[PDB]
Amino acid sequence: TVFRQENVDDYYDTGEELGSGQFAVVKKCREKSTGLQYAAKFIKKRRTKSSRRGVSREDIEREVSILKEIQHPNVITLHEVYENKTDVILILELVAGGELFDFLAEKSLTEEEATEFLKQILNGVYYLHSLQIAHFDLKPENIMLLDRNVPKPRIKIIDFGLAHKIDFGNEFKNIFGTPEFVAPEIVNYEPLGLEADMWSIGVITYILLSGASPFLGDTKQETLANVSAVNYEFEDEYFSNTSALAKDFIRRLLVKDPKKRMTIQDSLQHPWIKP
Ligand SMILES: COc1cc(O)cc(/C=C/c2ccc(O)cc2)c1
Numbered sequence: 001t002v003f004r005q006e007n008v009d010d011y012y013d014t015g016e017e018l019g020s021g022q023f024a025v026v027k028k029c030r031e032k033s034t035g036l037q038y039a040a041k042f043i044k045k046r047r048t049k050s051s052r053r054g055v056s057r058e059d060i061e062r063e064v065s066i067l068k069e070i071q072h073p074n075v076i077t078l079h080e081v082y083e084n085k086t087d088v089i090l091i092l093e094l095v096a097g098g099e100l101f102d103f104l105a106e107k108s109l110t111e112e113e114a115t116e117f118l119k120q121i122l123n124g125v126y127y128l129h130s131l132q133i134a135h136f137d138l139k140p141e142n143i144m145l146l147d148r149n150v151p152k153p154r155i156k157i158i159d160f161g162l163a164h165k166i167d168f169g170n171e172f173k174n175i176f177g178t179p180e181f182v183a184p185e186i187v188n189y190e191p192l193g194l195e196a197d198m199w200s201i202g203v204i205t206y207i208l209l210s211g212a213s214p215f216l217g218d219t220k221q222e223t224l225a226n227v228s229a230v231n232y233e234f235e236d237e238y239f240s241n242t243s244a245l246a247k248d249f250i251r252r253l254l255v256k257d258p259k260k261r262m263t264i265q266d267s268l269q270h271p272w273i274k275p
Contacts, residue, residue, distance in 0.1 A: 001061055003083040012091070014040060023055050024161070028094065038079055041090040045083075059161075060088050066133055066163045067092075074124030076158045095156045097145030103153070104140060104207070108238075111246055114208040115273065116152045117143075121201065122267055124157045129194045129264045134171070136162040136192070138200035139181040140207065166193050179223040180213050184256045187228045195258035198267065202253025209246060210238035214254070230256050245272045 015028040018039055029040040043063075046054035067078035067090070080091040097103075100117065109117070121143065128135060135142075137159055145153040164171050170191035177186060183199035185192055206214045214232035217223040226232065232254060234247055249272040255261040267273060 001064070003064075003081040003088060005083060007084070008040065008082045008089050008091075012038070012040060018096075023053070026092075028096070029091070031091075037094045039092045039094045041092055042087045043090070044087055045085075055088075055161075063160050063163065064088075064090065066160050066165070069131060070128070070133070070160075072124060072127040073154070074120050074156055075127065076156050076160075092158075093156070095144040095146055095158065097148040097153060099141055100143040100145065100155060101140035103145060103148055104211070108211040109208050111209065111243060113152075114205065114246075117155060117208060118201075118205060119273065120155045121157070121204065122264065122273065124155075125197055125201065126264045126268060128157075128163075129197070132166045132194070134164050134166050134192065134194050135160070135197050135200075136164060136175045136186075137177050137181075138197055138204065139178055140204065141178075143204075164192075169193055179220045179227065180216050182224075182227065183258070184228045184230070185258055187224045193258065194264070195261050198253050198261050198263065199255075199258075201267065202250050205246075205250050205253070206232070209242050209250075210235070212238050228256075230254060243272075248272065 011033065012029045012031055015030070018026040018028055020026070023044045024041055026039050026041045028037065030037050043060055044054040046056050064081055071077055076095065077093040078090060079093065082089040125135070135157065142157060142159040143155050144158050145155055147153055162175055162177060164173070170193040172191045174189065175182065175186050175192060181200045181203050183196040186196055203214060212235065215223055215226040217226055239247065249270050252262045262270065
């Protein structure tokens, strides 16, 4: 699938940088014809068949295809896609309140503040999983606020760079996500499905309530070993005033066997969440 090959600079002006990663950088931008503001994600293309630098076109096309399907208040929307010899440039909805991760460093949240964020995450993931889309990269870095100066900020899931359609119940590919947030099946290179996202939600919930990462070791290999062994516990120093029902929600997500883990529908009916 080919994308728009006119120079993006003829149609947009760029501004402040919003984030940069391994092979991509995101810049605030403004469409000249409308004055509307977006986030331009420049993804570096691979320049040879067998290179390790840049992103393969198959991977770029999958991210674009997923983004084109989604329209939900808690997920980023795609506006346009351009390309040139060096980059694919996705013009994405602008979410400018910063990461949940940076918001988290400023506060530990109350259970109400946690559940207000968490319910929005669950609603976005419910939409995705209903479409058989696994995100495969859920973590505070990929949750951005619309306005960080309201008591209950609205959030959007970003970065569909690892997302896959799961039309056969599972996909057998390597997912090099962030060790602190990946499920045991990712660590063990097993077939992957929607369940991996539910584990990540359990990790996110633990962090929201405590400010601490449940599996984090001193090295990436320690973290991955802890994940595979389900080596976590609720430290009383951090959880002493957290309700047992909140701990129960987490416990039913941080389950090694994907088949025994709560699904997204289970998580919405769980007594901690269900109104
Ligand atoms: C590319 O690498 C990164 C790393 C990172 O920590 C954050 C971002 C921000 C993405 C983004 C997308 C759409 C928006 O509207 C606003 C931000 C990008």
